Amino acid sequence: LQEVLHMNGTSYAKNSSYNLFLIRVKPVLEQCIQELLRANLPNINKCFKVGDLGCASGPNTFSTVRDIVQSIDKVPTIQIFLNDLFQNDFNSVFKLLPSFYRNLEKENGRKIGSCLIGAMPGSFYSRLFPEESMHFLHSCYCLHWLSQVPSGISVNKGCIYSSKASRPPIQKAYLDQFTKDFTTFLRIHSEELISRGRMLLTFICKEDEFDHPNSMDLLEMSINDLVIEGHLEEEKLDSFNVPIYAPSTEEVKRIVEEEGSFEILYLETFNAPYDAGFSISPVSCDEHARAAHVASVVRSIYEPILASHFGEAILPDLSHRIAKNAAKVLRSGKGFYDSVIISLAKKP
Amino acid sequence: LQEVLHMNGTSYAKNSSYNLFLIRVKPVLEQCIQELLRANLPNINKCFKVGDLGCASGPNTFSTVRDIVQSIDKVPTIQIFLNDLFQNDFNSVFKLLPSFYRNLEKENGRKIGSCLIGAMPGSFYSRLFPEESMHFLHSCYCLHWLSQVPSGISVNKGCIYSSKASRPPIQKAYLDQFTKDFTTFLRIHSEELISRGRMLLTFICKEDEFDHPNSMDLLEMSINDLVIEGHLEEEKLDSFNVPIYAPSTEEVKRIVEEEGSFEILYLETFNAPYDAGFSISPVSCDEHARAAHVASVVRSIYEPILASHFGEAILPDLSHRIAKNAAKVLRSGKGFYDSVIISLAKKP
Ligand SMILES: Nc1ncnc2c1ncn2[C@@H]1O[C@H](CSCC[C@H](N)C(=O)O)[C@@H](O)[C@H]1O
Ligand SMILES: Nc1ncnc2c1ncn2[C@@H]1O[C@H](CSCC[C@H](N)C(=O)O)[C@@H](O)[C@H]1O
Ligand SMILES: Cn1cnc2c1c(=O)[nH]c(=O)n2C
Ligand SMILES: Cn1cnc2c1c(=O)[nH]c(=O)n2C
């Protein structure tokens, strides 16, 4: 998937929003960075070296950089490495850099050349940076993507991942894959961090106490509609497996403590409404448009993988079922994407 | 030009060749890198940090990385930053990285993750890297490009740059621009280098003793043909000025010594035949094809700037005149691109 997985190049950019997860991350990001400067890590007041792991493209890429930069300058050279898979749309980010830099100088006074933005492409499940070279690593909404479909060909009937309705051997196969992946992530990136360096990670979580469908759940139920309706053969659904896990906070916690590289400074979950990134009639129109927006966001996350497995002909039917499902969920008051945020410091 | 200048995205890749300049650079590159390891710069045996300034795209980008990597490993983590202007075709380099990395491991044994290739886009006339962070900076065939058209609207009649036929106020305007630009280059990048760090630079030079037309000279004479022939109004030629200088070695030497940041370790010129990158009938066919190749290479360097000034309609006529001119030059035995190579060490 290293050379297959990426967000939609409509686009992830057009459908993304600061208002979904990044605004919840921001205060925690801010506190993390301020604590780092106060900790006086070697060279941090000369050059603050930061990586954004799974930056994608679009406004969110720039919004995350802005948040970092403003956090650092809140009342040092900044070297930012943007990381994503080798077929991410880097060219478009780089073309927006000249205006980004000017706007940075008009906004903050940050002289041009004092914030140095480059890219380091590759999988965050492999080494990206020299040993003990980085102060801070940030990733938002990436770590639920696995390095591969769980290494357990086997039939996950009526399901596309370890959903609540999936059988326990599937659930165990997906957990074991996440464990491998996340342990590797932690082992590798701890080595890249300067002593007492930090990571701030935000990704999908599963909460036993709630019952809120995540984007994969909305997708799964919508593919199911289509087989029931007759539009898709049951074999297409039975063969489709997404390389994505939704962990519990206890699972996240056990993995980190097992790895041993990091102390947990902060660990919380939060629930983001589906349409938090949506802006504005009767009211059936209002809710139609909100549901249609949700479906666009969900299509923008999964289209590459959906097109390779199913072909392009079912995607408009799929978008239609996702919207219908989205609206029913929001009406029941369970229309939230559940997310965990965890702040880690490298142990001496 | 920071946001306008770039090589042709036919393409610079298809028309480029290791055999033109890089094979001449290679032995000097090799000696430079070996001397660096022996000098024991801080951290160099942990992580060797290298920048390629004006990497472009195509085989040459990868050939330069390969040469660096093989030089380092000749009987350490390697972090390579590829730099070019913000609208360079980075996406295509990154997409070739997965196979590059595998081929690196099949060739050398270089484990994956021990050579870390990223990008730092921007003008090399501004800061690219944190202070005292780099061991070695390499640039081949870039530094003759100026930051702007010489800051001397004024009419350069019948000429496109400071050619031998250009009047002395033009020559002085172009030299003064190169002086500003190259001095800035040196001041800025010296600051980025770790103590006793080095630069290896290769670019076009002008030699009083020879009389060999460079690619701009071939272009200039070919645009002149077209005005004489009637295909182009003299005003189009009189208004066209390329942001490019061809310095003498004495001019290069004076600038470096004036700047004061660098000691010169090595300084030589070499003359590269026009068709050194060309592979294979009577013989008028052979020489036709060799001349046509030269014209393609010349079009691939200048098409973006030619299209913006002249429009697209004259380019096939232009390619035809460049080939005719190329063949006459080669036949006289003066068909060489004259180049200088200079090795610099940061003074204590
Ligand atoms: N192993 C991996 N290495 C690098 N990037 C990965 C990855 N697995 C998933 N991703 C990236 O994770 C991103 C998820 S979308 C999140 C993007 C950004 N952090 C934001 O807030 O909008 C995608 O761009 C995808 O390509
Ligand atoms: N100010 C500048 N900053 C960064 N790159 C520049 C530049 N001025 C010119 N260049 C780059 O110089 C390159 C010249 S072609 C040389 C490319 C490569 N070194 C090789 O051996 O093939 C172009 O890609 C162009 O975009
Ligand atoms: C709702 N939403 C918004 N962005 C995302 C999601 C998601 O569910 N998974 C996911 O991977 N990403 C990037
Ligand atoms: C002959 N040749 C091959 N490559 C180049 C040239 C040149 O003349 N200028 C120039 O800038 N570049 C990149």
Q: Which amino acid is at B98?
A: P
Q: Nearest C-alpha to atom 2 of ligand 3 is from which residue? A: A215
Contact A94, B86 (CB under 8 A): yes
Q: Is B15 in the pocket of ligand 4 (CB under 6 A)?
A: no
Helix ranges, A96-156 (H)? 97-107
For residue B49, what are the CA distances in angstroms to A103, A106, A242, B77? Answer: 30, 32, 38, 8
Spans of all domains in chain B? 1-14+148-173+208-241+274-333, 15-147+174-207+242-273+334-348
Residue A342, φ and ψ in degrees, nearest 5: -135, 125
Q: Nearest C-alpha to atom 7 of ligand 4 is from which residue? A: B215
Residue A57 sits at the vertex; the CA angle it makes with A337 and A70, to the nearest 5 degrees, is: 85
Breaks in chain A (C to N over 2.5 Å), named by the residue before each, are 9, 75, 152, 280
**Which single residue is written with the structure tokens 């939704």?**
A246
Q: In angstroms, rounded to a whole number, what is the distance separating the alpha carbons of residues B5 and A38? A: 43
Q: Nearest C-alpha to atom 11 of ligand 2 is from which residue? A: B54
Contact B203, B339 (CB under 8 A): yes
Residues 109-148 of B with CB under 8 A from A: 112-113, 116-122, 126-131, 133
Residues 65-84 of B with CB under 8 A from A: 77, 79, 81
**Is residue A183 within a helix (H) or strand (E), and if so which, with residue range?**
helix A168-192
Give, to the nearest 10 degrees, the angle between helix B215-229 and helix B284-310. Answer: 80
Question: Measured between CA atoms, how close is A134 to chain B, in angstroms?
Answer: 13
Contact B238, B160 (CB under 8 A): no
Q: How far is the CA of A290 from the centre of ligand 3 (A)?
A: 17
Contact A260, A196 (CB under 8 A): no
- What fold, for B15-147+174-207+242-273+334-348? Rossmann fold (3.40.50)
Buried b (16+ CB within 10 A) or exposed e, A108-142: eebeeebbbbbbbbbbbbebbbbebbbbbbbbbbb
Is the CB of B184 inside 8 Å of chain A's CB atoms? no
CA–centroid distance for B267 within its chain: 16
Report the DSSP beta bridge partners of residue B116.
Answer: B79
**Is residue A306 within a helix (H) or strand (E), and if so which, with residue range?**
helix A284-310
Contact A241, A166 (CB under 8 A): no
Q: β-strands A262-273, A336-346: how paired? A: antiparallel
For residue A259, what are the CA distances in angstroms to A262, A345, B14? Answer: 8, 13, 48
Contact B269, B207 (CB under 8 A): yes
Residue A210, φ and ψ in degrees, nearest 5: -100, -65
Contact B215, B49 (CB under 8 A): no
In B, which residues are within 8 Å of A95 by CB distance?
A: 86-87
Q: How far is the CA of A83 from the centre of ligand 3 (A)?
A: 17
- How many residues would you count in chain B? 348
Sign of CA dihedral B14, B62, B24, B50: positive
Q: Which amino acid is at B170?
A: I
In A, which residues are within 8 Å of B81 by CB distance?
A: 118
Please, how many CA atoms are within 13 Å of residue B74, restricted to the half-sphere of its CB? Answer: 19
Q: Which amino acid is at A83?
A: N
Helix ranges, chain B (H)? 12-15, 22-38, 59-72, 90-95, 97-107, 168-192, 215-229, 234-239, 249-259, 284-310, 315-332
Buried b (16+ CB within 10 A) or exposed e, A228-242: eeeebeeebbeebbb
Is the CB of A99 inside 8 Å of chain B's CB atoms? no
Buried b (16+ CB within 10 A) or exposed e, A178-200: bbbbbbbbbebbbbbbbebbbbb
Contact B93, B84 (CB under 8 A): no
Question: What is the resolution in angstroms?
Answer: 2.0
Residue B202 sits at the vertex; the CA angle it makes with B200 and B208, to the nearest 5 degrees, is: 130
End-to-end CA distance of chain A: 34
Nearest to A266 by CA among A83, A33, A53, A44: A33
Q: In angstroms, rounded to a whole number, what is the distance separating the alpha carbons of residues A203 and A268? A: 11
Contact B88, A95 (CB under 8 A): no
- What fold, for B1-14+148-173+208-241+274-333? 1.10.1200
Q: In angstroms, rounded to a whole number, what is the distance separating the alpha carbons of residues B152 and B170? A: 8
Q: In angstroms, rounded to a whole number, what is the distance separating the alpha carbons of residues A118 and A105? A: 18
Q: In angstroms, rounded to a whole number, what is the distance separating the alpha carbons of residues B81 and B172? A: 35
**Is residue A193 within a helix (H) or strand (E), and if so which, with residue range?**
strand A193-204
Q: In angstroms, rounded to a whole number, what is the distance separating the alpha carbons of residues B54 and B85? A: 8
Q: Is B100 in the pocket of ligand 4 (CB under 6 A)?
A: no
Residue A15, φ and ψ in degrees, nearest 5: -95, -10
The reply to whether B15-147+174-207+242-273+334-348 shares the fold of B1-14+148-173+208-241+274-333 is no
Inter-chain touch A97–B120, beta carbons under 8 Å: no
For residue A294, what are the CA distances in angstroms to A240, A276, A325, B99, B255? Answer: 22, 10, 10, 37, 61
Q: How is residue A172 written in tokens? A: 């165990």
